[PDB]
Amino acid sequence: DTLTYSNSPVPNALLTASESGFLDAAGIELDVLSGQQGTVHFTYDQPAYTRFGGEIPPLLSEGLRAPGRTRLLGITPLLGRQGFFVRDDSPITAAADLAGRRIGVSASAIRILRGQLGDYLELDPWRQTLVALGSWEARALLHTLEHGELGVDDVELVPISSPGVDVPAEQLEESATVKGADLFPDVARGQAAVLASGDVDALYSWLPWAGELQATGARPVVDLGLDERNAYASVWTVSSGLVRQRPGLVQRLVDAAVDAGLWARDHSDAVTSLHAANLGVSTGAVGQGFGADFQQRLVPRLDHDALALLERTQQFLLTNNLLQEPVALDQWAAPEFLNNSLNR
């Protein structure tokens, strides 16, 4: 059987199972989305498509645009190096030092931080979701400033390009695939240039990109990776029709991912290498961006704690008017598959 697929720059068992041969052994092959069919990463408009990535796009698709296209198979938390970075030689060493300083943020984050979404509800799926992705910077800045007893009104917001948030349709369509290596090349080099421009004092970085940025000689004012309130819930989705029409196939898919997750615990280097190649980053940056022993936490989850994390992100979207009505997570989830896999 052949399924189309994609994954965000996050640790996940779908990519692991595919590159390690577990899917092949299960008689399943995956074809990554080309740049020309890349919008599916945000719309889920395909009959046999599966994605393991950030939760914002699927929450918007299910809760705002097209209820019913997907089912949730599992969750894998994400937490690692994260925060507003400054150059090592910067006199800024504490959160309080950000008072009155120039914070570089995406146009999307600026809409959210100002509480002025503009034409948000009238935008097409791709551009609309990109506005919501400004949430990462927005929440991170609020939490960072809290440490210095400051608020957003205490700093200067300056527009800059942020990876994953600023992705023009032309850029997407020109990319060979939606793999991080093709869509997000040399991110840290670009962020280091922004910090060297003389027009900004700090900017948001995370994922392996933050690891490479740190290597250029930069540091986070506050490492948000040290506090769980900055974690996100990566989600694994699949076309709803496959769940209803081909449960046997979905079960084989989930079994393979679970086996790959167990296997990963004893093959840390191989797992680090395959994620690094998929995203186009150094192997050392993977560990910094996802956490030292992320390979021990790759078996997908649907327990109460994992669902609460996903709900937390959803609430940030609702509070900030990026969603009007919430997605019923218990209905969206199809726990039977993961439950059967873990009972083997």
Q: Write out the residues near ligand OBP by the rule CB under 6 A.
A: 8-9, 41, 53-54, 56-57, 133, 164, 167
155/284 Cα distance (integer angstroms): 33
Tell me how far, at minimum, the Cβ of 10 lies from ligand OBP, in Å. Answer: 6
Are the CB atoms for 177 and 4 separated by under 8 Å? no
When the beta carbons of 53 and 77 are compared against ligand OBP, the nearer one is 53
Q: Residue 278 or 341: which CB sits closer to ligand OBP?
A: 278
Q: C-alpha 283: how far from its chain's center?
A: 19
Neighbour tally for 119: CB within 10 Å: 10
Cβ–Cβ under 8 Å, residues 163 and 208 = no
Residues 6+ apart with CB under 8 A from 95: 144, 145, 146, 147, 148, 150, 221, 222
Kindly report the number of other CB atoms within 10 A of residue 34's CB atom.
Answer: 15
Beta strands 29-32 and 2-7, pairing class: parallel
Q: Which of 79, 155 has the CB closer to ligand OBP? A: 79
- Distance of alpha carbon 203 from alpha carbon 162, whole angstroms: 9
Closest approach of ligand OBP to the CB of residue 281, in Å: 12
**289 vs 78: CA distance, rounded Å:** 9
Tokens of 15: 């990519």
**Closest separation in Å from C-beta 5 to ligand OBP:** 12
H-only helix segments in 265-301: 268-279, 283-290
Nearest distance, CB of residue 151 and ligand OBP, angstroms = 27
Q: How far is the CB of 260 from ligand OBP (least distance, A)?
A: 20
Residue 239, beta-bridge partner list: 70
- Of 167 and 317, nearer to ligand OBP (C-beta) is 167
133 or 250: whose CB is closer to ligand OBP?
133
Alpha-carbon distance 86 to 89, whole Å? 8
Nearest approach in angstroms of CB 9 to ligand OBP is: 5
Compute the least distance from the CB of residue 57 to ligand OBP, in Å: 5
Taking the mean position of all CA atoms in its chain, how far away is CA 27? 28
Nearer to ligand OBP, 154 or 166 (CB): 166
Nearest residue to ligand OBP, using CB? 54
CB nearer to ligand OBP: give 96 or 169: 169
